[PDB]
Amino acid sequence: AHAFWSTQPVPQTEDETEKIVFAGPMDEPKTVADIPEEPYPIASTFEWWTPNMEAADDIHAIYELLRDNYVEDDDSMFRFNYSEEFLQWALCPPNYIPDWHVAVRRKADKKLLAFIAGVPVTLRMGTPKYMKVKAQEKGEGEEAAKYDEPRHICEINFLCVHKQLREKRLAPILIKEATRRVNRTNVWQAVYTAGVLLPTPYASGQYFHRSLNPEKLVEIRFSGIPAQYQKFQNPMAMLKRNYQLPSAPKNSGLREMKPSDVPQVRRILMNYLDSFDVGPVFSDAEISHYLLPRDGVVFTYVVENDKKVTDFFSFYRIPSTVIGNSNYNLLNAAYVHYYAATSIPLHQLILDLLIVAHSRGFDVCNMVEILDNRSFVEQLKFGAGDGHLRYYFYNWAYPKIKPSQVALVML
Ligand SMILES: CCCCCCCCCCCCCC(=O)SCCNC(=O)CCNC(=O)[C@H](O)C(C)(C)COP(=O)(O)OP(=O)(O)OC[C@H]1O[C@@H](n2cnc3c(N)ncnc32)[C@H](O)[C@@H]1OP(=O)(O)O
Ligand SMILES: NCCCC[C@H](NC(=O)[C@H](CO)NC(=O)CCCCCCCCCO)C(=O)NCCC1CCCCC1
Ligand SMILES: [Mg+2]
Numbered sequence: 190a191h192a193f194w195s196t197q198p199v200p201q202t203e204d205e206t207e208k209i210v211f212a213g214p215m216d217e218p219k220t221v222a223d224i225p226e227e228p229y230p231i232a233s234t235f236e237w238w239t240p241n242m243e244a245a246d247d248i249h250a251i252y253e254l255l256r257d258n259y260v261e262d263d264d265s266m267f268r269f270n271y272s273e274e275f276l277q278w279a280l281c282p283p284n285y286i287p288d289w290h291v292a293v294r295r296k297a298d299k300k301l302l303a304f305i306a307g308v309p310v311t312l313r314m315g316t317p318k319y320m321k322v323k324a325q326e327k328g329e330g331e332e333a334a335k336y337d338e339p340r341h342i343c344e345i346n347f348l349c350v351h352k353q354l355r356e357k358r359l360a361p362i363l364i365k366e367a368t369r370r371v372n373r374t375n376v377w378q379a380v381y382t383a384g385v386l387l388p389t390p391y392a393s394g395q396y397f398h399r400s401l402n403p404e405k406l407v408e409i410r411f412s413g414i415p416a417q418y419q420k421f422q423n424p425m426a427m428l429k430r431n432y433q434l435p436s437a438p439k440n441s442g443l444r445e446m447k448p449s450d451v452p453q454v455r456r457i458l459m460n461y462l463d464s465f466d467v468g469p470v471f472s473d474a475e476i477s478h479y480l481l482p483r484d485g486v487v488f489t490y491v492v493e494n495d496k497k498v499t500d501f502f503s504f505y506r507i508p509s510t511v512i513g514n515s516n517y518n519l520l521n522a523a524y525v526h527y528y529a530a531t532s533i534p535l536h537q538l539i540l541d542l543l544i545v546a547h548s549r550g551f552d553v554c555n556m557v558e559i560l561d562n563r564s565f566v567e568q569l570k571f572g573a574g575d576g577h578l579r580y581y582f583y584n585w586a587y588p589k590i591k592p593s594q595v596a597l598v599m600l
Contacts, residue, residue, distance in 0.1 A: 193361040198584040200389040212316045229366045238292040267509040283474040310344040317466035345381040379583040390579035394558040394592030397571040401547040438541040446489040453498035461529040468596030502528035525556035536565040559595040
């Protein structure tokens with residue numbers, strides 16, 4: 190079945206994943222000094238390249254590769270169009286390792302053919318709550334607790350092979366070279382996500398979509414006028430009315446996040462995320478980086494009561510190219526990012542996210558059913574789409590968990 194993934198330290202089947210009762214590594218313990226110091230062999234017409242990520246042409250080259258060759262929906266109607274500013278943000282968090290950004294170029298002309306990115310993340314990835322209970326029952330609490338400490342690992346994103354090089358076994362070479370560069374820095378696990386099923390996810394959830402500009406979504410066939418609307422004399426205007434939103438936020442204490450909010454947002458986010466089995470731990474510099482507003486990229490608002498931050502929400506922007514429509518080239522999507530509510534119901538916090546996104550010209554708001562996102566689906570009129578996001582670890586056995594026990598938002 191899997192000539193590459195059968196050779197890797199990952200659970201090989203659902204049945205095997207069903208058998209896992211404790212968190213912990215899969216592979217032989219190794220040491221840095223055992224890992225090759227030379228780059229993995231590659232054919233003589235290609236070369237490895239480490240882009241500099243904060244330098245504009247290098248970001249542009251990766252931008253072009255992903256604009257033309259990154260993920261599409263299953264019908265090849267939309268392709269992500271991550272911006273250059275978004276990629277500089279996502280790939281350069283505090284203390285990022287430049288060497289974990291890996292590219293293949295054609296040696297002759299320096300054409301970018303393939304890319305993968307790794308960034309640091311500190312992740313809680315110890316045995317989950319339901320499995321710690323069974324451990325107590327059986328007198329196995331010490332082994333269930335062994336890997337409780339948050340670990341400094343690699344978060345992978347943006348794997349892409351140019352369309353002309355597909356199914357030539359180039360993705361395994363890129364994945365082995367990234368693994369080598371991460372292991373040479375004494376890091377032995379990774380976390381990654383994909384829309385496709387690979388061996389073997391520890392969690393899976395559907396995507397949900399909240400229509401903000403239904404007339405455009407219908408015109409570009411992102412959504413339709415649903416068959417039920419045919420009972421109406423005028424199906425589209427009913428649909429506009431259905432999804433209409435206030436022109437201004439309803440929580441009076443809401444404002445954009447500023448730098449002096451960082452310690453309070455860190456505190457309330459960290460305390461909220463402790464309720465999930467798998468989630469990130471962020472320093473003040475990582476809260477600053479991932480949450481302070483950046484135009485066109487990330488948008489963050491706080492609710493301030495009596496000069497204290499009591500709630501906040503964030504969303505990020507990823508446009509998609511619309512492949513072939515005569516009226517529109519781009520789908521402007523907002524994605525639910527981190528949030529925490531302590532003074533109001535979550536639905537009432539996230540209604541203001543929808544309000545602000547619509548005010549700023551977003552067409553749809555998207556999310557996976559991680560965090561407590563299911564708690565506001567029905568009242569805020571999100572509907573399930575056709576895709577899923579699957580969560581995976583490299584070199585980590587982990588019991589299957591529900592997606593509502595996952596607190597890591599992937600960009
Ligand atoms: C400790 C540090 C560890 C660091 C690394 C941790 C692991 C990170 C792992 C990567 C996480 C990435 C997270 C994301 O970014 S998920 C998004 C991935 N990108 C896209 O979908 C963009 C469009 N497609 C492509 O660019 C190509 O189709 C890709 C690059 C996906 C595959 O190229 P191609 O189609 O030309 O195929 P090949 O002949 O070269 O290679 C075939 C082999 O590739 C296996 N395959 C197919 N799709 C994926 C996939 N999404 N993750 C992992 N493996 C995948 C496949 O099962 C087969 O192996 P096996 O079935 O024969 O065994
Ligand atoms: N195939 C035809 C177009 C479907 C468009 C949309 N689907 C997605 O965007 C899907 C997600 O659903 N996207 C994809 O499948 C592509 C991405 C999948 C994940 C890739 C992640 C890579 C991660 C790297 O770390 C969708 O279903 N829209 C329906 C909206 C509707 C609004 C009214 C209420 C009901 C819903
Ligand atoms: Mg290939």
